[PDB]
């Protein structure tokens, strides 16, 4: 479901901040059914990024999976082209991780990875490239009910603005999420890209929400890939092996999400 949602049917509320060329607001849609939704308002300055920001969310709308956020449609809401998608109560994971680095143990982290890998495998099967996998773009639907054992639940946000059109300056600032082959030529974006980013994303999860290579600058980030280094194993290096397998400078050596799911399940609960 990807419809041309009208500005008349959208009510904006509180702003959740801004992002990569977007202003984020909580709102409501009127279809009569009123439904809470997330509104990513593409700034008018960067309005030329719409041909990929929304076309990607569109293809993700055609597919169905319990771990893919629902992208409802688009609005030519005035001077801005806006994305209307499902709202997630607890927001991005990268923040939730840092806010609860201690309480979050190994079992909690493992279930999240399984849920993510499931969505990535789904995308791989459907051959849909995300291009922006990261603990930021992972949204927490449900917390862990320890006393009841209820597992957490996550949903993968929309693909976003393609890295095939973003400026090279921000691509280098996005290392180690943007894989090497894409830094070399952005037109190398392929399914293998998300495997690398999955490794970087897994590092975030194991690191209690920390950010890989936050201290380095773009030039030093460029050298890390030049020297073909690898991310360090977090303080809880139970998954360190799988990270490096995904962050493999040879794209064809990065394991399929089918095999990755097996590894994750092999780690027991």
Ligand X SMILES: Nc1ncnc2c1ncn2[C@@H]1O[C@H](COP(=O)(O)OP(=O)(O)OP(=O)(O)O)[C@@H](O)[C@H]1O
Contact 96, 140 (CB under 8 A): yes
| Options 13-21, 214-222, 228-236, 245-253: segment touching ligand X (CB under 6 A) | 13-21
Q: Look up tokens 């973003």; give the residue.
A: 166
Cα 150 from Cα 232, distance rounded (Å): 31
Look at the alpha carbons of 163, 58, 54, 10 in this order and tell me if their dihedral is positive or negative.
negative
Site for ligand X in 206-265 (CB under 6 A): none
The answer to the question of residue 52 lying near ligand X (CB under 6 A) is no
Per-residue b/e over 171-196, b at no fewer than 16 CB within 10 Å? Answer: bbebbbbbbbbbbeebebbebbbbbb
Q: Applying CB under 6 A, does 170 fall inside the site for ligand X? A: no
117 near a copy of itself, judged by CB under 8 A: no
Element holding 59 (H helix, E strand)? helix 50-62
DSSP symbol at 210: -
Taking CB within 5 to 8 Å according to partner kind, which of Mg ion, a copy of itself, ligand X, none is near residue 17? ligand X
The answer to whether 29 contacts ligand X (rule: CB under 6 A) is: no
SS3 18: strand
Which residues, 66 to 95, sit near a copy of itself by CB under 8 A?
A: 73-79, 81
- Least distance to a copy of itself from the beta carbon of 179, Å? 22
Binding track, positions 87-106, relative to ligand X; x by CB under 6 A: xx--xx--x-----------
Shortest distance, CB of residue 38 to ligand X, whole angstroms? 4
**Between vectors from CA 51 to CA 50 and to CA 53, what angle results, nearest 5°?**
55
Q: What is the DSSP string of 190-205?
A: -HHHHHHHHHHHHHHH
Task: Answer whether 150's CB lies under 8 Å from 144's CB.
Answer: yes
> Is 83 or 239 the residue whose CB approaches ligand X more closely?
83
Which of these ranges, 16-24, 51-59, 86-94, 105-113, lies near a copy of itself under the rule CB under 8 A?
Answer: 51-59
Q: Residue 48, interface with a copy of itself (CB under 8 A)?
A: yes
Shortest distance, position 248 Cβ to ligand X, whole Å: 24
- Residues at the site binding Mg ion, with contacts judged by CB under 5 A: 137, 157, 160
| Contact footprint for a copy of itself (CB under 8 A) | 2-7, 47-52, 54-55, 58, 73-79, 81
């Amino acid at each position: 479901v990807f419809h041309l949602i009208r500005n008349e049917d959208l009510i904006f509320n509180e702003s959740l901040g801004q992002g990569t060329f977007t202003k984020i607001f909580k709102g409501v849609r009127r279809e009569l059914h009123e439904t809470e939704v997330l509104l990513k308002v593409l700034d008018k300055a960067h309005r030329n990024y719409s041909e990929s920001f929304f076309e990607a969310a569109s293809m993700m709308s055609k597919l169905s999976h319990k771990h893919l956020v629902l992208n409802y449609g688009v609005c030519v809401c005035g001077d801005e082209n806006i994305l209307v998608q499902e709202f997630v109560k607890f927001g991005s994971l990268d923040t939730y991780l840092k806010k609860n680095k201690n309480c979050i143990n190994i079992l909690w982290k493992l279930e999240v990875a399984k849920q993510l890998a499931a969505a990535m495998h789904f995308l791989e099967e459907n051959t849909l490239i995300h291009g922006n996998v990261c603990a930021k773009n992972i949204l927490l639907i449900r917390e862990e009910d320890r006393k009841t054992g209820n597992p957490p639940f996550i949903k993968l946000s929309d693909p976003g603005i393609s890295i095939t059109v973003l400026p090279k300056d921000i691509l280098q600032e996005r290392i180690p999420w943007v894989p090497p082959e894409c830094i070399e030529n952005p037109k190398n974006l392929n399914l293998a890209t998300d495997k690398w980013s999955f490794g970087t994303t897994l590092w975030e999860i194991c690191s209690g929400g920390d950010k890989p290579l936050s201290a380095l600058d773009s030039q030093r980030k460029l050298q890390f890939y030049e020297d073909r280094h690898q991310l360090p194993a977090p303080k809880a290096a139970e998954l360190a092996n799988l990270i490096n397998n995904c962050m493999d400078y040879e794209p064809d050596h990065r394991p399929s999400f089918r095999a990755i799911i097996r590894d994750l399940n092999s780690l027991f609960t």
